[PDB]
Amino acid sequence: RPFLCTWXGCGKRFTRSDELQRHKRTHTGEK
Numbered sequence: 001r002p003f004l005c006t007w008x009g010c011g012k013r014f015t016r017s018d019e020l021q022r023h024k025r026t027h028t029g030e031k
Protein backbone atom coordinates (compact mmCIF):
# COMPACT_ATOMS: atom_id res chain seq x y z
CA ARG A 1 0.00 0.00 0.00
CA PRO A 2 1.58 3.29 -1.18
CA PHE A 3 1.60 5.38 1.99
CA LEU A 4 1.58 8.72 0.21
CA CYS A 5 1.63 12.09 1.92
CA THR A 6 -1.33 14.04 0.60
CA TRP A 7 -0.46 17.36 2.22
CA UNK A 8 -0.41 20.25 -0.32
CA GLY A 9 1.97 19.32 -3.13
CA CYS A 10 4.12 17.25 -0.81
CA GLY A 11 3.44 14.02 -2.68
CA LYS A 12 6.10 11.94 -0.95
CA ARG A 13 5.37 8.21 -1.06
CA PHE A 14 6.31 5.75 1.67
CA THR A 15 6.41 1.98 1.95
CA ARG A 16 5.68 1.74 5.67
CA SER A 17 2.95 3.57 7.56
CA ASP A 18 5.42 4.46 10.32
CA GLU A 19 7.46 6.32 7.72
CA LEU A 20 4.40 8.34 6.72
CA GLN A 21 3.43 8.89 10.37
CA ARG A 22 6.94 10.09 11.13
CA HIS A 23 6.85 12.31 8.06
CA LYS A 24 3.38 13.68 8.87
CA ARG A 25 4.88 14.99 12.12
CA THR A 26 6.57 17.66 10.01
CA HIS A 27 3.24 19.08 8.87
CA THR A 28 1.64 18.55 12.27
CA GLY A 29 3.03 21.65 13.96
CA GLU A 30 6.05 23.87 13.43
CA LYS A 31 8.69 21.39 12.30
Ligand SMILES: [Zn+2]
Binding pocket: 005, 006, 007, 010, 011, 012, 023, 024, 027
Ligand atom coordinates in the same frame (compact mmCIF):
# COMPACT_ATOMS: atom_id res chain seq x y z
ZN1 LIG B 1 4.42 15.69 3.43
